[PDB]
Design a protein around this ligand. Structure first.
Ligand code: NI
Ligand code: NI
Length: 166
């Protein structure tokens, strides 16, 4: 469990450093991953960027699956996103660095993403809808973008208890 930096901290604005080839498969890289999962499981989030705990590395984790749009548990390093078409889809987002709030954000509906897993094996997936949304959201942290900077319709930005009574 680690401190989630909250919006306004200048560490969330960094352009993150690539993970060095040298740490691929290293113990230090494992501790970080473990902390990130423990921290994300504890505050009940769907995803987490290393910069959100003030670690300046292109490293994100995400994964959603319970009684019900599932997303596989993934550890993506040094990622790179390619939109597959011009189609956009609005949907609800929150974030642990912006507690108390939700916003509607329009994202690419279909992406390819590529990167490395923690042992340096390449990742290369084509995804749509929610899975595509989460990856776009987490990769924004690595270029110092939080989701309010992405909102086009501020009629749908507000406090969670006000937008969602239940
Ligand atoms: Ni190197
Ligand atoms: Ni986030």
């Amino acid at each position: 469990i680690r401190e989630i930096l909250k919006m306004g901290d200048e560490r969330l604005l960094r352009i993150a450093q690539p993970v060095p080839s040298e740490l691929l498969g290293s113990e230090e890289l494992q501790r970080l991953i473990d902390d990130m999962f423990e921290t994300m499981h504890h505050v009940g989030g769907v995803g987490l960027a290393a910069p959100q705990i003030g670690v300046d590395l292109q490293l994100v984790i995400f994964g959603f699956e319970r009684s019900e749009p599932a997303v596989p548990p993934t550890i993506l390093l040094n990622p790179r996103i390619t939109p597959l078409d011009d189609e956009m889809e609005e949907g609800w987002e929150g974030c642990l660095s912006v507690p108390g709030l939700r916003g509607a954000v329009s994202r690419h509906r279909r992406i390819r993403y590529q990167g490395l897993d923690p042992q340096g094996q390449p990742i290369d997936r084509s995804v749509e809808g929610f899975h595509a949304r989460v990856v776009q959201h987490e990769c924004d942290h690595l270029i110092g973008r939080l989701y309010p900077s992405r909102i086009t319709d501020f009629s749908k930005f507000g406090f969670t208890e006000v937008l969602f009574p239940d």
